[PDB]
Design a protein around this ligand. Structure first.
Ligand SMILES: Nc1ccn([C@@H]2O[C@H](COP(=O)(O)OP(=O)(O)OP(=O)(O)O)[C@@H](O)[C@H]2O)c(=O)n1
Ligand SMILES: Nc1ccn([C@@H]2O[C@H](COP(=O)(O)OP(=O)(O)OP(=O)(O)O)[C@@H](O)[C@H]2O)c(=O)n1
Ligand SMILES: [Mg+2]
Ligand SMILES: [Mg+2]
Lengths: 221, 220
C-alpha cells in the first residue's frame, strides 16, 4: 500500500486581492473557492486522504462545509506558505504516508486527470509539479526601464505538486521559506518532473482574477 | 487630432497548436477566434478603423466574415510577427492615424475597457501595453536541471499594445525581429506605460488552451 495524501493550502490572506475576506473563502456560484478543488480530491480515487490547512479563525467556516470520511483533519496554517506546508507534514507524520500532493486552494479549477498524472509522475522520480509553458513576452521592471527576459525553456510553476513524503519532509527539515515546494526539494539534488498543465490552473491572485473564476465556475458542476 | 486604428494580426501559422489550421481560424462556438476581438473593436467607440493582417490564402475566409464599414482593409502579412506589423504600417500611411493599437488575434477575449484604457495611457509617453503581474513560481530549464527566476517586478506582456503612429514607424524603419512592439520602441528611449489587464487576455498558443477558450466563448 502506498497512501497518497493531499494537502489543501488555505491559510493565506490574499492581500493582493484587496478584499475583506481571504480569496479562498470568497463565494462563486454558491460555494467557497476552496470547495472546488476540495471535491476534485474527494472524488479522486488516487487520493486516500485530505488535510485542509487554514488559519485558526477559519476552522468553523471549514468544519461546517466539509463532511467527508477522506478528510483527516483541519490543520492550523503558518505565517507563510512553507510553514503551512510544514504544519501539514507534522500532522501527517502519524500516518506515515507514501506520497503527498500539495495544492494552492486559490487555484480552484483542478481536474481529476491532473491529480493522478502528477502523483504517478512523482512515483517515478520522487518529485513533480504541474507546469505551463510561457506564451507571453516576459519582462522585469528596473528603475523606469523594462528588461525583456529571455523566453526559451520558461515555465510557470502551477500546483498540484507531488512528492514522496520523506523527500518533501527531508527538504523542510531545516526550515526555510520558498514560493513553492519543488525549489526546496531540488536543493536535495532531486530532479523535478514537469507535467503539462493548462490555463485553468491559474491562481486567483488579483481582483481582476475573479471575473474569470466566475466564468469557469458557472460551467464547473 | 484624431483617428485610432486597431491592427488585428492574423497572419501566423500557429505551429505550436499542432493543428493543420492556424489557431486564428479555429471555430469556437460557431465563430472563428479572430471574430471575437474583431467585434470588440467594431463595437468600440475608441476605434475609428480596423486593419486585419492575414496570410494570402486565407483572404476570402476573412472577407466572408466582415460585416462592417469600420474595417479599412485586409493586408497581407509576412513570415514574422514584426514583418506582419510592418505590412500594416505601410497600408496605413495613407490613413495617417494618430494612434495604432496592435492586437494578437489569438488573444480572443478582449474587452472594451482595455481597448480604451490602453489608448488613453498610450497618449502620455506615446507607448503603452496591457500587462499582467506574474503570479506563479517561475523557472527556466537547463538540460534536465531547472533554475528559479527571481520574480520581483516581472510582468507578462499582453496585447493590445497601442502607440502613436509616428513612433512605431520610427521603431520599425530599419527592420528587425521581436516578440512584440514595445521592445523595439523602448530601444528608441521611449518609456512604456504598463496597463493592468486580466487573465482573459491570454493567448491561445497550445492545444491545451482550447478548452478554456470554449468556456469563455460560451459567455460572449
Ligand atoms: N501562510 C500561508 C500563505 C499562503 N498559503 C496558501 O498558498 C497558496 C498560494 O499563495 P498565494 O496565492 O500568494 O496566497 P496568499 O498568500 O493568500 O496571497 P497574497 O500573497 O496576496 O497574500 C494559497 O492557496 C494560500 O492560501 C497558505 O496556505 N498559508
Ligand atoms: N508572421 C506572423 C506571425 C505572428 N503573427 C500574429 O502574432 C500573434 C501572436 O503570435 P503567436 O502566438 O506566436 O502566433 P503564431 O506565430 O501563429 O504561433 P506559433 O509560434 O506556434 O507559430 C498571432 O495572433 C499571429 O497571428 C502574425 O500576424 N504574423
Ligand atoms: Mg502569498
Ligand atoms: Mg510565433
Amino acid at each position: 500500500h502506498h497512501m497518497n495524501v493531499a494537502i489543501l493550502l488555505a491559510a493565506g490572506k490574499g492581500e493582493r486581492m484587496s478584499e475583506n475576506v481571504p480569496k479562498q473563502f470568497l463565494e462563486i456560484e454558491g460555494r467557497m473557492l476552496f470547495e472546488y478543488p476540495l471535491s476534485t480530491f474527494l472524488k479522486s480515487e488516487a487520493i486516500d486522504g485530505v488535510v485542509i490547512v487554514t488559519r485558526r479563525e477559519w476552522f468553523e467556516v471549514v468544519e461546517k462545509r466539509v463532511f467527508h470520511e477522506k478528510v483527516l483533519g483541519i490543520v492550523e496554517g503558518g505565517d507563510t506558505r512553507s510553514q503551512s506546508v510544514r504544519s501539514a507534514l507534522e500532522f501527517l507524520e502519524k500516518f506515515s504516508p507514501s506520497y503527498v500532493l500539495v495544492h494552492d486552494s486559490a487555484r480552484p479549477f483542478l481536474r481529476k486527470k491532473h491529480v493522478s498524472e502528477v502523483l504517478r509522475r512523482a512515483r517515478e522520480t520522487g518529485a513533480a509539479t504541474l507546469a505551463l509553458k510561457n506564451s507571453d513576452a516576459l519582462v522585469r521592471v528596473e528603475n523606469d526601464r523594462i528588461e525583456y527576459i529571455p523566453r526559451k525553456g520558461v515555465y510557470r510553476i502551477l500546483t498540484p505538486q507531488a512528492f514522496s513524503y520523506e523527500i518533501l519532509k527531508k527538504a523542510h527539515e531545516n526550515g526555510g521559506e520558498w514560493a513553492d515546494d519543488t525549489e526546496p526539494v531540488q536543493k536535495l539534488g532531486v530532479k523535478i518532473a514537469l507535467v503539462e498543465g493548462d490555463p485553468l490552473c491559474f491562481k486567483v491572485t488579483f481582483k481582476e482574477d475573479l471575473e474569470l473564476a466566475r466564468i469557469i465556475a458557472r460551467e464547473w458542476e
